[PDB]
Amino acid sequence: SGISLDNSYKMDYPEMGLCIIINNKNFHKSTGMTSRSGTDVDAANLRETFRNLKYEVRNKNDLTREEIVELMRDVSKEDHSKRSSFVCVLLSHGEEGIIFGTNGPVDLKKITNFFRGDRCRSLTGKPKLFIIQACRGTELDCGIETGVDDDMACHKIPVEADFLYAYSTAPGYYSWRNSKDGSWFIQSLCAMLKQYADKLEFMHILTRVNRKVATEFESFSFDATFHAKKQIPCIVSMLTKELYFYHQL
Amino acid sequence: LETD
């Protein structure tokens, strides 16, 4: 055939892949964690958005730390050979590097390690997307008014390659959620995927999500500590190719 | 408005 290029992930497998949504709203009383009002709005928005991108969406509500790990383990052990990609959305309380089950914390690294290139072989070389709506700390953004190492005989890739983490907020910062409308980040992500998934490469979609969250939202609080604060999401990419949700017919 |  003619000249061929390899700059984008193959996204025309028979299935787009799973989209697992872990929606933690209600926490055990002994954790002292508050109910996450609005998170069902996010969960529904995501289900609809990824449905229209032709993902197999599986929603899970109110999972313990043990259940989160068992779920991820089981999903990583499925045969994904006929799937283009994998998406996991985590909606919960969090701190830096940590997401909360209903009864206590899970290291994000424990969850994503199940999908490493050497541990989930049917996803090796395919994009693995983790979308994380959770705090990463307690900082508040006040805002501002505006030849040994070459040509190896056996080709390997890094086990950490082909992950993308779309974090709702910068490292160290709170993440904001409206009780009625859902989280700023998930609202914006769904809106931008609806508008641009058939038009733009994913990193460029997420850049528009960054701009929308950064410019269109500001907190309002009767507590001066928490009033008039801003948020910027944080894209963390170890992808090795461009990612388009569409393909040529 | 709440934080996560």
d(Cα A90, Cα A61) in Å, to the nearest integer? 11
Copy the structure tokens of residue A171. 């490292």
Backbone torsions φ then ψ of A190, nearest 5 degrees: -65, -40
Please indicate whether, in this complex, the C-beta atoms of B1 and A221 are within 8 angstroms of each other: yes
The residue of chain B with its CA nearest to that of A219 is: B1
CA distance A9 to chain B (A): 33
d(Cα A20, Cα A123) in Å, to the nearest integer? 15
Cβ density class A133-152: b for 16+ within 10 Å, e for less: bbbbbeebbeeeeeeeeeee
Which ranges in A53-107 belong to alpha helices (H)? 65-76
Count A/B contacts: CB-CB distance under 8 Å.
34
Q: Distance of alpha carbon A15 from its chain centroid, rounded?
A: 19
1.10.3720.10, 3.40.50.1980, 3.40.50.1460, 3.30.70.1450: which CATH number matches A1-249?
3.40.50.1460
Method of determination used here: X-ray
Backbone torsions φ then ψ of A144, nearest 5 degrees: -145, 135
CA distance B1 to chain A (A): 5
From the list A92, A134, A177, the residue facing B2 with the nearest CB is: A177
Return the axis-axis angle of helices A39-52 and A184-196, rounded to nearest 10°.
Answer: 20
- Cβ-based neighbour number of residue A67 at 10 Å: 16
